[PDB]
Design a protein around this nucleic acid. Structure first.
Ligand code: CL
Ligand code: CL
Ligand code: K
Ligand code: MG
Ligand code: MG
Ligand code: MG
Ligand code: MG
Ligand code: MG
Ligand code: MG
Ligand code: MG
Ligand code: MG
Ligand code: MG
Ligand code: MG
Ligand code: MG
Ligand code: MG
Ligand code: MG
Ligand code: MG
Ligand code: MG
Ligand code: MG
Ligand code: MG
Ligand code: MG
Ligand code: MG
Ligand code: MG
Ligand code: MG
Ligand code: MG
Ligand code: MG
Ligand code: MG
Ligand code: MG
Ligand code: NA
Ligand code: NA
Ligand code: NA
Ligand code: NA
Ligand code: NA
Ligand code: NA
Ligand code: NA
Ligand code: NA
Ligand code: NA
Ligand code: NA
Ligand code: NA
Ligand code: NA
Ligand code: NA
Ligand code: NA
Ligand code: NA
Ligand code: NA
Ligand code: NA
Ligand code: NA
Ligand code: SR
Ligand code: SR
Ligand code: SR
Ligand code: SR
Ligand code: SR
Ligand code: SR
Ligand code: SR
Ligand code: SR
Ligand code: SR
Ligand code: SR
Ligand code: SR
Ligand code: SR
Ligand code: SR
Ligand code: SR
Ligand code: SR
Ligand code: SR
Ligand code: SR
Ligand code: SR
Ligand code: SR
Ligand code: SR
Ligand code: SR
Ligand code: SR
Ligand code: SR
Ligand code: SR
Ligand code: SR
Ligand code: SR
Ligand code: SR
Ligand code: SR
Ligand code: SR
Ligand code: SR
Ligand code: SR
Ligand code: SR
Ligand code: SR
Ligand code: SR
Ligand code: SR
Ligand code: SR
Ligand code: SR
Ligand code: SR
Lengths: 337, 53, 132
RNA sequence: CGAGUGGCUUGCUACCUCGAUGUCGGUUCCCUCCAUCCUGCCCGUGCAGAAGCGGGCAAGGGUGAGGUUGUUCGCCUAUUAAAGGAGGUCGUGAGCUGGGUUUAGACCGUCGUGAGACAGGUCGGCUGCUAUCUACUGGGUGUGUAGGUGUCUGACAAGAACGACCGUAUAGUACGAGAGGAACUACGGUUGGUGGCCACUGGUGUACCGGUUGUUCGAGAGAGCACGUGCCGGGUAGCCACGCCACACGGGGUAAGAGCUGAACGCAUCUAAGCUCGAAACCCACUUGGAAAAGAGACACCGCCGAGGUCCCGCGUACAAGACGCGGUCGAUAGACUCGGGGUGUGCGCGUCGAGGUAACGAGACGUUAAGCCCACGAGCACUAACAGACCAA
RNA sequence: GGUCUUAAGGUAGCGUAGUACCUUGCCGCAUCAGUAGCGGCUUGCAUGAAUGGAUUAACCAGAGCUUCACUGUCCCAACGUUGGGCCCGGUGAACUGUACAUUCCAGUGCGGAGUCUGGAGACACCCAGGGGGAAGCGAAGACCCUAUGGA
RNA sequence: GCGAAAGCCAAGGCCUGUCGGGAGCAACCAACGUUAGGGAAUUCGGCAAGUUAGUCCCGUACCUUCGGAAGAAGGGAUGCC
RNA sequence: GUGGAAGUCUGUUAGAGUUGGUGUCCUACAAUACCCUCUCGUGAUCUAUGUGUAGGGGUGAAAGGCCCAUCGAGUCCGGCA
């Protein structure tokens, strides 16, 4: 009778093409509530290990008991909020108005940008504050970059640059807050933004797998029984009915799979530290050793080891925060074996 | 916990526990041990085992 | 149902033949259905530790044979995961015949039972000799 | 009895096609319709409750597994929130199947003097093609906007990114004589769907290590062949699912419906103007694509004798070509080496033992030996190789 | 009906059959559930004695059914091996071609349109792909009817 | 080894079942290896694949034309010194 | 116990054949091929060469099979434009 069955794969993550920027780009930011503050940070994926935690959930039958939890280790050294960009509201949406830069730049930012030699931070600030007076000011964001050099396991030195919105109290106050960070040198850390136990949304470009067929790429069945021995094993039944006389873009076909941007919601931050406590014996496979600022994210994170991952305060958390979970054990057993 | 087979310590958050027919219980640290046990080999007769050692 | 307290990889399907761990007179049971389950196209309905299932008696006493009864899976060969990460697996797949109220039809259970199961069906537990 | 709508059944017609548009059923994969089976929100009841029964809005999602039969259909079984129906050349054979129908062989019953026949039954019985165009899934090169780097905007576009269930508290409460027996709300979990990931468990692993059969190199040692591992055991990286993680609340506008104010019609009236509410449905929220959006975009800095770029070289977080990303002595990018971290399971040789045997000989055991062999990982380390160098450029 | 056509009026056996339309006949077995299968019943639409009946050990790449064992047939797919596929040197065909051709949604039309009408969309070229459409290519339809055709 | 069987090796013949080079070498296809738990649920149908296997000892039903059925079935053993 | 019969059994001995895969191929290696599975293999067996039967005629353990890629009446040329 032709039983029903959901379609193969989601139509919400396409087209399934190769990502334009390996550096993830958030398409949304948290709401403005608490004191002003940068709404995101970044780091490089290292690998996974597991930890043993004391159950936090006050609604759990296991509250207060040992619990093994998988963790992905992300090296999160300090970043540099190098500039302050202002957006003005226009009939055609938000548009960049101007930027306020600094003087102190990391020694290798010149591997990506044409660092400013002659800039005027006051004319820019002036224009911005004037825009606020006029009431045409759109959100405020910081031009941020990473310091790959601080991470030995990562070969690159060329910083990765991304823009991160600044949210918070009143615009006047966060505008002032933004200028403060920038002017210093822009140096800020994971602490300044997140606290262990909070929920973050992680974004990253998935592991690439080049071209793959419909079975792997879309999860369609393989031909079954006798149908698998006639010359077709991993090909779909048909590309569509007689009419419409065309192939719809909705039918599962071969193509690029992997290396797509993905934003994974509600990842609990288990612990933010520095040192080599999470590192693994023999070294993380295909990565290296960790000994410095790091963040332990609960579960999995998109991308291969070494890829740039971005954090943001969760924009749609399902649960309340239970800060600083008690970590009783952090596995350091070799990941080879 | 120690591996009821080779003797080494079992990394927490790891290993398997096999429940025998009569209700007994054997905690294995890895497949290697389980597999040698399945072959009918005794840990004391295998040089690489802590037990043996 | 009440949270089991462990992660289960169903190791049985509709049609699987399993051991009846009790003294009801039924020796072997065949899985016909899984309570509360609804699968997907082409998917064989699966059952594992803790599930209540409808069964038909394949081997046993004349009076029991062919009867269609309810039961509870108490042991399975495919591993399950406990909160602490350890996996647990049994020597066989077994179930216990139970009635409309989930009370064991038999008078004695044979072999060990999983703590997780005992906790969900207390009366079944209050009949077990060993609880692993 | 009367009036209609559909084009799912059947019939009728012979308009299209006989220099051929391959049958039924199934399968796989995609889109849709609503006359709604479930799920959401409602109205009535011969509505106490619980539950039924009937009706309204509503197509977001779901609608599954099995036994006979080629079957469609249908009958039957256990599950289920429910296991709805229909269109797409009765969607789908330049996709599959070939069980039925529908060639040639053969049998039975019936018919026929006979050859032979019979939507009667029965056993057997063939499925060609290297894609030109178009269509779509992905990947490039150019031109246009009109020197370079980095960061963005967001017109538009896609989504189900989420659907459903069980359980606990509420509560043995409301209701009811009792039997029976709710809800709001807050929680825990399961299932189907979705995206990603490998610490854990599992699979693989013709890297690797070991055991061992036949045979050949005289034995030993060490090896070849026995199909891309002779066979067996274990298994690293990697890849994977059977493993693990994540997948809203809340706004805004409505339908059916419940109402407010309110007149035509002094009254009344949810409606005519106005207004308050109100669906899993609509819009927003969230994710993904997106400067070729021809109004062809915005910002900052750098540069026009040089910013930037190409060739070249060492490589992969990338990869069918192309593309992409990193490093190039201001260096740890690759290899060697040594540590570390892993796999296997105790090497050759020698010494003791060894059932025996005059002796020769001797399977095998213990010791040396956590040995030997091996590693697609990490660290250290400039030892080797990233040299030398050529060119474009407002 | 308790003979009549046309000579006789179906005996032993077998029987819902490779023959039974009705039909998934009815009872039973077996299965959670069996239009199947086997046993029984049997008035046989339309069995039946060398148009041979019945029956049957042995035999069978003959048709149907059940059970034990086993298994990636399936749940639900994964990883690996060899040869191709992809890039490079060399060699180097064929099928097919009225023309034009970047199409999509509707409509119209000899009622089944890339080309007509109205809109929508559409910068050119190239690589790989699985085959929706060109009522795709291949063969002057083996079906059906017609011919004062053939065998 | 039962063997004119398999497998390996001589004498003898050959590298001409005659295009090569390159990418850890993707999708997809042809042959094929290994797959946890379930075990025919798949399908018209166990189609395909698999299971069993050589030899010796024990033991072997219905039925039968007394030949057979029969290697019925089922159970045990198997090297080296 | 001897004996060693059999249109007897197993058997890729030679040799003959072809159940299934509806596998590969299907502008092929091939106008009937390839691989695995499968059947026969002391006889109504298989096989070479010679020889005979000729077209409304042969030959046929019978399928309208075969008689030089064609047979419900061969092929060639002629009747014939
Ligand atoms: Cl299929
Ligand atoms: Cl079921
Ligand atoms: K026709
Ligand atoms: Mg590992
Ligand atoms: Mg481990
Ligand atoms: Mg199905
Ligand atoms: Mg006509
Ligand atoms: Mg056609
Ligand atoms: Mg309606
Ligand atoms: Mg009610
Ligand atoms: Mg829909
Ligand atoms: Mg059709
Ligand atoms: Mg077609
Ligand atoms: Mg075809
Ligand atoms: Mg084809
Ligand atoms: Mg048939
Ligand atoms: Mg004939
Ligand atoms: Mg006919
Ligand atoms: Mg047939
Ligand atoms: Mg019968
Ligand atoms: Mg007679
Ligand atoms: Mg004609
Ligand atoms: Mg005819
Ligand atoms: Mg004639
Ligand atoms: Mg398996
Ligand atoms: Mg089926
Ligand atoms: Mg077979
Ligand atoms: Mg002759
Ligand atoms: Na084929
Ligand atoms: Na078609
Ligand atoms: Na009508
Ligand atoms: Na709906
Ligand atoms: Na059915
Ligand atoms: Na058609
Ligand atoms: Na079809
Ligand atoms: Na076909
Ligand atoms: Na078909
Ligand atoms: Na609303
Ligand atoms: Na007769
Ligand atoms: Na025969
Ligand atoms: Na397989
Ligand atoms: Na096509
Ligand atoms: Na040559
Ligand atoms: Na005798
Ligand atoms: Na054959
Ligand atoms: Na003739
Ligand atoms: Sr269909
Ligand atoms: Sr960004
Ligand atoms: Sr966006
Ligand atoms: Sr085929
Ligand atoms: Sr069409
Ligand atoms: Sr035609
Ligand atoms: Sr409607
Ligand atoms: Sr309802
Ligand atoms: Sr039909
Ligand atoms: Sr019917
Ligand atoms: Sr039929
Ligand atoms: Sr017929
Ligand atoms: Sr047929
Ligand atoms: Sr132009
Ligand atoms: Sr309740
Ligand atoms: Sr009561
Ligand atoms: Sr070999
Ligand atoms: Sr063997
Ligand atoms: Sr209203
Ligand atoms: Sr542009
Ligand atoms: Sr009679
Ligand atoms: Sr006979
Ligand atoms: Sr036009
Ligand atoms: Sr192709
Ligand atoms: Sr030789
Ligand atoms: Sr040559
Ligand atoms: Sr292996
Ligand atoms: Sr079957
Ligand atoms: Sr079946
Ligand atoms: Sr035996
Ligand atoms: Sr013979
Ligand atoms: Sr065939
Ligand atoms: Sr085969
Ligand atoms: Sr052929
Ligand atoms: Sr034979
Ligand atoms: Sr002989
Ligand atoms: Sr011929
Ligand atoms: Sr002539």
């Amino acid at each position: 009778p032709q039983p029903s069955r959901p379609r193969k794969g989601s139509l919400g993550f396409g087209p399934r093409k190769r990502s334009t920027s390996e550096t993830p780009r958030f398409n949304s930011w948290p709401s403005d509530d608490g004191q002003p503050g940068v709404q995101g940070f970044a780091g490089y994926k290292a690998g996974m290990t597991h930890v043993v935690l004391v159950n936090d959930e006050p609604n759990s039958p296991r509250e207060g008991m040992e619990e093994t939890v998988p963790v992905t280790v992300i090296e999160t050294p300090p970043m540099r909020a190098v500039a302050l960009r202002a957006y003005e509201d226009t009939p055609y949406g938000q548009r960049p108005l101007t930027e306020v830069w600094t003087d102190e730049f990391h020694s290798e930012l010149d591997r990506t940008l044409d660092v400013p030699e002659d800039h005027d931070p006051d004319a820019a600030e002036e224009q911005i504050r004037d825009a606020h007076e006029a009431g045409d000011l759109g959100d405020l964001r910081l031009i941020t970059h990473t310091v790959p050099d601080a991470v030995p396991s990562v070969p690159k030195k060329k910083p990765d640059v991304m823009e991160t919105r600044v949210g918070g109290g009143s615009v006047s106050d966060r505008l002032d807050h933004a200028l403060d960070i920038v002017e210093d040198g822009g140096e800020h850390a994971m602490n300044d933004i997140f606290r262990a136990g909070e929920y973050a949304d992680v974004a990253g470009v998935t592991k690439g797998k080049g071209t793959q067929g419909p079975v792997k790429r879309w999860g369609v069945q393989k031909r079954k029984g006798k149908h698998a021995r006639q010359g077709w094993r991993r090909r779909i039944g048909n590309l569509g009915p007689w009419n419409p006389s065309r192939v719809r873009s909705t039918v599962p076909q071969q193509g690029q799979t992997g290396y797509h941007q993905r934003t994974e919601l509600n990842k609990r931050l288990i612990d933010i530290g520095e040192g080599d406590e999470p590192t693994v014996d023999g070294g993380f496979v295909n990565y290296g050793e960790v000994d410095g600022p790091y963040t332990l994210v609960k579960g999995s994170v998109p991308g291969p080891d070494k890829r740039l991952v971005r954090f943001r305060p969760a924009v749609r958390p399902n649960d309340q925060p239970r800060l600083d979970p008690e970590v009783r054990y952090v596995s350091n057993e070799s990941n080879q074996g | 916990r120690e591996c009821d087979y080779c003797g080494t310590d079992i990394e927490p958050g790891t290993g398997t526990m096999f429940v025998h027919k009569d209700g007994a219980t054997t905690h294995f640290c890895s497949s290697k041990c389980e597999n040698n046990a399945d072959l009918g080999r005794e840990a004391r007769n295998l040089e690489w085992t802590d037990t043996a050692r | 149902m009440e949270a089991l307290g462990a992660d289960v990889t169903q190791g049985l399907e509709k049609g699987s033949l399993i051991t009846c761990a009790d003294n009801t007179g039924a020796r072997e049971l065949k899985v016909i259905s899984v309570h509360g389950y609804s699968g997907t196209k082409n998917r064989l309905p699966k059952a594992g530790l803790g599930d209540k299932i409808t069964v038909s008696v394949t081997k046993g006493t004349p009076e029991m044979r062919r009867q269609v009864l309810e039961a509870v899976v108490v042991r399975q060969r495919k591993p399950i995961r406990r909160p602490d990460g350890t996996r647990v697996k049994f020597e066989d797949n077994a179930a216990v015949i139970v009635d409309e109220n989930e009370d064991p039809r038999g008078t004695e259970l044979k072999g060990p039972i999983a703590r997780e199961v005992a906790q969900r069906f207390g009366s079944v537990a209050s009949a077990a000799t060993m609880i692993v």
